[PDB]
Design a protein around this ligand. Structure first.
Ligand SMILES: [Mg+2]
Length: 155
């Protein structure tokens, strides 16, 4: 039994911005539950995070989670950039909100009622899933049902 869940994540977004898609699995105790959906026009960043969310967002009890991911947005955001935000209010020193704060403030919910270990894979060609996840994003790309309302094209 996955005696406390391993999560996999990715996200593609076909242009910048163009339609995006999030890839993900949660292998809950043993079984596996997956997550996908298309965004009419979005970005790579907001799809990785997006993903980092959902996964957490549907974990009903107090899990011990291994969120393995590839990202250098979600890594760079965790092991570096957040620590300063909470410290300042999610504002630059310019005292100008940060980009994507909308999804950022979120992942930070879910990432505060669970024990998370980040397994930042280069991986590429590692754990079927890191790739599975990928497929899943390319797949939701090609069929975009929703509208990324957080994605504000500016400021
Ligand atoms: Mg990606």
């Amino acid at each position: 039994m996955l005696k406390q869940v391993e999560i996999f994540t990715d996200g593609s977004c076909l242009g910048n911005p163009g339609p995006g898609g999030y890839g993900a699995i949660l292998r809950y105790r043993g079984r596996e539950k997956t997550f996908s959906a298309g965004y009419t026009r979005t970005t790579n960043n907001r799809m990785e995070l997006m993903a980092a969310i959902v996964a957490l967002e549907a974990l009903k009890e107090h899990c011990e989670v291994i969120l393995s991911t590839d990202s250098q947005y979600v890594r760079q955001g965790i092991t570096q950039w957040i620590h300063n935000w909470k410290k300042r209010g999610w504002k630059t020193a310019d005292k100008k909100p940060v980009k994507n704060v909308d999804l950022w403030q979120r992942l930070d919910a879910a990432l505060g009622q669970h024990q998370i270990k980040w397994e930042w894979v280069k991986g590429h060609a590692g754990h079927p899933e890191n790739e599975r996840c990928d497929e899943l994003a390319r797949a939701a790309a090609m069929n975009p049902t929703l509208e990324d309302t957080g994605y504000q094209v500016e400021v």
